[PDB]
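Dear colleague,

Thank you for sharing your sequence with our group. We've completed the structure prediction you requested, and as agreed, I am returning the results in plain text so they can be pasted directly into your records. Please verify that the sequence below matches your submission; if there's any discrepancy, let me know and we will rerun it promptly.
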Amino acid sequence: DYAGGVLAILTQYFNNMVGYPEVSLKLAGEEANMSREGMINQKEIVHQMVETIRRASEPIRQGRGFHDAYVYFASVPENAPPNSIALPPQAQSEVQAKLTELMQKLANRNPQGVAEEEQELA
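Please find the predicted structure tokens below.
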């Protein structure tokens, strides 16, 4: 249920549990799963999700690499590594609108898979 997996990842991101680049790596994991099973439409949607988060996060990031300077969606949690920040309010709105559109496209491709994730989340 790769589409469901994507929903779970976005839930953690929007709840400031996971930041960039971790969120993009998790999405890339699902992207590879989709591509392996020939789910190209879904793969392309998740690729756009990754690009959306990368383009908003990479230019304002106070560092580089994979162990610090994370960029969280709206708030920096107390377990964040040094030099972590959150997106500015305008970027928050732009990123969420685009991700919501992309998530809708995914849900439309695999409604049973996304519904199951919503059930599992509950």
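Summary note from our side: Residues 1-122 form one domain.

Kind regards,
the structure core
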